[PDB]
Amino acid sequence: TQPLGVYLLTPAVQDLWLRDKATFTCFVVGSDLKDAHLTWEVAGKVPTGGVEEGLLERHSNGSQSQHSRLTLPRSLWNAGTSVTCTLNHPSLPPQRLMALREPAAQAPVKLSLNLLASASWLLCEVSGFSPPNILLMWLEDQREVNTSGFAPARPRSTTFWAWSVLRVPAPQPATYTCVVSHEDSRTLLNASRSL
Amino acid sequence: PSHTQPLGVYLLTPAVQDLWLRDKATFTCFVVGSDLKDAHLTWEVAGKVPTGGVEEGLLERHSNGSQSQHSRLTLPRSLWNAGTSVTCTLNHPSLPPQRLMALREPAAQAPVKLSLNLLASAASWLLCEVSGFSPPNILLMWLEDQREVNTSGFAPARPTTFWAWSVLRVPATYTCVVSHEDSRTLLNASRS
Ligand SMILES: *[C@@H]1O[C@H](CO)[C@@H](O[C@@H]2O[C@H](CO)[C@@H](O[C@@H]3O[C@H](CO[C@H]4O[C@H](CO[C@H]5O[C@H](CO)[C@@H](O)[C@H](O)[C@@H]5O)[C@@H](O)[C@H](O[C@H]5O[C@H](CO)[C@@H](O)[C@H](O)[C@@H]5O)[C@@H]4O)[C@@H](O)[C@H](O[C@H]4O[C@H](CO)[C@@H](O)[C@H](O)[C@@H]4O[C@H]4O[C@H](CO)[C@@H](O)[C@H](O)[C@@H]4O[C@H]4O[C@H](CO)[C@@H](O)[C@H](O)[C@@H]4O)[C@@H]3O)[C@H](O)[C@H]2NC(C)=O)[C@H](O)[C@H]1NC(C)=O
Ligand SMILES: *[C@@H]1O[C@H](CO)[C@@H](O[C@@H]2O[C@H](CO)[C@@H](O[C@@H]3O[C@H](CO[C@H]4O[C@H](CO)[C@@H](O)[C@H](O[C@H]5O[C@H](CO)[C@@H](O)[C@H](O)[C@@H]5O)[C@@H]4O)[C@@H](O)[C@H](O[C@H]4O[C@H](CO)[C@@H](O)[C@H](O)[C@@H]4O[C@H]4O[C@H](CO)[C@@H](O)[C@H](O)[C@@H]4O)[C@@H]3O)[C@H](O)[C@H]2NC(C)=O)[C@H](O)[C@H]1NC(C)=O
Ligand SMILES: *[C@@H]1O[C@H](CO)[C@@H](O)[C@H](O)[C@H]1NC(C)=O
Ligand SMILES: *[C@@H]1O[C@H](CO)[C@@H](O)[C@H](O)[C@H]1NC(C)=O
């Protein structure tokens, strides 16, 4: 019998902020994915549209990968919609994965952006959220920036907190925006500070 | 007859903490697959078999039908520091020998120098700057006295050479240790 590893990837900040869309990616890794198929369910219904099945991929090591993508309007995401991918293979019982707003999940209360030194160093902080899985993005006049150093989420508390430092070269004035998406508590924070 | 299986071999290189705290360089080599009974991971140090220090691992079995087995080879830091060529090989009967090499690559620029200072100042914030190296594969570690502190924000390298930087947040002597694998180079700084 073949092993099958199926994963469900939640949408990234870039899709949710720059494109007003939430793209869920569900892919199975296997030895022979011919008759293994991925089905979708948005809030318990088969999707009307927005599903774009990927192509089967042979791999050098003998494994095979096939993926399927589902795109939701960001409104459905912030509302807490449930997305359920299913892996159906005739040799195995069905394997469902789910990305849903968790009742036990705390939204990130506050996001704080200020400056720390002068090349300028911009500090973005977000606190009061759980689970600790966090996604952060930096932007420079609606254009994405990557020169950042992100500190993963660290702990009296029920929550976690994280921060990322962005260093921008000393040069035109600019406004920097820090966007954070907590996925299990479908929040999308965003802040602007200017220099 | 018989049909072959998916077999994926991987090789981990020593970590900063391993070299800086223990003076030992452990190379973890493992293979992921379906039926790993006839899969034997073998080592070569400097191009010859190691006399000792190899810990073959039990066959891990995962909840998705995959099997995994890891063999690790621990070397003195001096051996790593010298540039000793480490090699892992997967020997399955119906498959070719698959070798993953952890060499000191000749074309690998080594980190020029390491910088450590204070970025800002309730808590305070440090910096660590590693400059002029390639490939960008690099590992960092902060230490409060002889104790590791994990409250850093690391910025991986972006583009002749590369440079990365890490900001540590502190609530002592703070040392930043840098490990560059391809040029078996290790650098530390210190501050107070
Ligand atoms: C069924 O499920 C099982 C369970 O997961 C699946 O098994 C997994 O299979 C995948 C196969 O792709 C493996 O991924 C590879 O992993 C290696 C290394 O893995 C290390 O890191 C993992 C993640 O660690 C982080 O997360 C964990 C949380 O789980 C956390 O605890 C940890 O602290 C850390 O934060 C570890 O999980 C893993 O530990 C496991 O294995 C240990 C050894 O066996 C064992 O001691 C542990 O107890 C544990 O069991 C391990 O520490 C990745 O390196 C590798 O990615 C390389 O390869 C891909 C190609 O696929 C490439 O795209 C990447 O860029 C990367 O390439 C590097 O390596 C190449 C050499 O192989 C080199 O040529 C490249 O240049 C690059 O090298 C760079 O870095 C290295 C540094 O070592 C340096 O040498 C180079 O110079 C250069 O700098 C894969 O991602 C999983 O590890 C494996 N999981 C387990 C638990 O075994 C199975 O696949 C599923 N089956 C199916 C059908 O789906
Ligand atoms: C033969 O070689 C192939 C190719 O290298 C191997 O295929 C790889 O298999 C591994 C095994 O799991 C896959 O790792 C998984 O990756 C998940 C996300 O991957 C994303 O990032 C990677 C790297 O950045 C990208 O390459 C991927 O993009 C590829 O796939 C998309 C979709 O098809 C394509 O569009 C792209 O072009 C690429 O082709 C992805 O973007 C990762 O989340 C996952 O980690 C979860 O699972 C492990 C268990 O293995 C947990 O330890 C871990 O904590 C995570 O678990 C949490 O998260 C998941 C959701 O992510 C939840 O479901 C869990 O419940 C839990 O919350 C895992 O690491 C790898 O993606 C895949 N590579 C490719 C290119 O397909 C074969 O394995 C190999 N065969 C053998 C036998 O060795
Ligand atoms: C980010 O968008 C939110 C909507 O939730 C809004 O309240 C806030 O003013 C925006 N941030 C900035 C800096 O404009
Ligand atoms: C790193 O630490 C060792 C031992 O503490 C010391 O000998 C060495 O001089 C340090 N590195 C530098 C660049 O001074």
Side-chain angles (χ1 to χ4, degrees), chain A residues 1-90 92-109 111-141 144-155 157-171 173-192 194-195, chain B residues 1-2 4-112 114-120 122-136 138-145 148-149 151-190:
Chain A
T1 174
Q2 69 171 276
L4 293 103
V6 54
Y7 315 89
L8 187 73
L9 296 91
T10 72
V13 179
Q14 292 83 3
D15 294 350
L16 283 163
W17 181 248
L18 278 178
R19 277 93 89 174
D20 193 68
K21 67 178 184 181
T23 311
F24 293 81
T25 309
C26 180
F27 77 107
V28 48
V29 177
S31 321
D32 188 0
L33 299 181
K34 194 205 311 168
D35 303 330
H37 301 104
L38 295 169
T39 46
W40 288 92
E41 273 184 351
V42 196
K45 343 158 295 234
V46 200
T48 76
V51 185
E52 303 122 19
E53 176 105 16
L55 265 161
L56 181 60
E57 299 180 356
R58 253 88 185 187
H59 277 161
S60 298
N61 55 4
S63 284
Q64 307 191 18
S65 168
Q66 194 164 11
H67 78 91
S68 176
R69 299 183 178 275
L70 168 64
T71 301
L72 304 192
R74 179 194 157 187
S75 65
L76 279 174
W77 189 76
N78 282 96
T81 318
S82 171
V83 179
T84 310
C85 179
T86 313
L87 162 65
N88 306 88
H89 184 54
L92 276 73
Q95 311 241 6
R96 281 203 283 99
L97 290 83
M98 312 189 65
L100 43 103
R101 209 259 202 240
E102 290 288 351
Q106 264 273 111
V109 278
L111 188 130
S112 318
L113 171 58
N114 49 42
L115 194 138
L116 264 193
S118 294
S120 297
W121 313 72
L122 296 157
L123 168 65
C124 188
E125 298 177 343
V126 60
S127 57
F129 62 91
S130 65
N133 238 266
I134 181 182
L135 298 175
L136 189 144
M137 178 179 58
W138 284 101
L139 306 89
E140 204 176 47
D141 298 338
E144 197 184 342
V145 185
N146 288 287
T147 85
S148 50
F150 181 79
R154 319 272 311 194
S157 71
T158 314
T159 54
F160 305 80
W161 90 289
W163 54 265
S164 185
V165 172
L166 167 88
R167 88 144 244 155
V168 278
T175 64
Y176 295 82
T177 63
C178 170
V179 189
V180 162
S181 86
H182 198 244
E183 232 290 330
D184 272 0
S185 88
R186 310 207 162 177
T187 310
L188 189 138
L189 304 170
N190 59 320
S192 185
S194 315
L195 44 73
Chain B
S2 174
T4 196
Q5 56 176 82
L7 266 157
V9 62
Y10 310 87
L11 172 63
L12 295 91
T13 47
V16 192
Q17 312 84 21
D18 246 332
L19 297 163
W20 175 264
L21 298 167
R22 252 144 292 163
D23 278 16
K24 68 178 194 174
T26 306
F27 293 80
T28 306
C29 182
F30 71 100
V31 63
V32 191
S34 300
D35 208 352
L36 305 194
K37 51 175 52 178
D38 284 314
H40 306 279
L41 296 172
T42 67
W43 288 98
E44 276 186 355
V45 182
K48 282 93 182 189
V49 193
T51 65
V54 172
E55 298 145 297
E56 225 172 25
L58 300 172
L59 181 63
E60 286 178 291
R61 305 189 320 282
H62 306 279
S63 57
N64 54 354
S66 286
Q67 291 185 357
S68 169
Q69 177 198 142
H70 83 92
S71 178
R72 39 175 48 199
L73 161 78
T74 307
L75 303 177
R77 167 154 80 147
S78 62
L79 276 188
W80 182 85
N81 189 15
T84 320
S85 71
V86 183
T87 289
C88 183
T89 307
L90 181 69
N91 309 279
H92 212 269
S94 51
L95 275 153
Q98 309 221 39
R99 295 188 180 274
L100 285 155
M101 292 180 291
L103 320 174
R104 203 294 187 189
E105 295 295 334
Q109 277 70 42
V112 181
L114 201 162
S115 299
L116 203 167
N117 58 340
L118 287 181
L119 181 65
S124 300
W125 311 71
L126 282 88
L127 248 161
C128 187
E129 320 201 62
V130 53
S131 49
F133 60 93
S134 74
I138 190 175
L139 287 63
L140 274 75
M141 175 188 55
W142 292 92
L143 294 123
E144 199 162 29
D145 298 351
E148 318 106 293
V149 55
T151 61
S152 75
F154 176 58
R158 280 157 207 93
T160 307
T161 58
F162 306 88
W163 76 292
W165 54 272
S166 189
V167 170
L168 179 70
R169 182 202 200 271
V170 292
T173 66
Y174 301 142
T175 73
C176 176
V177 180
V178 157
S179 170
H180 194 246
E181 195 64 38
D182 302 282
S183 64
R184 253 104 124 138
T185 296
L186 201 155
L187 316 88
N188 39 329
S190 218

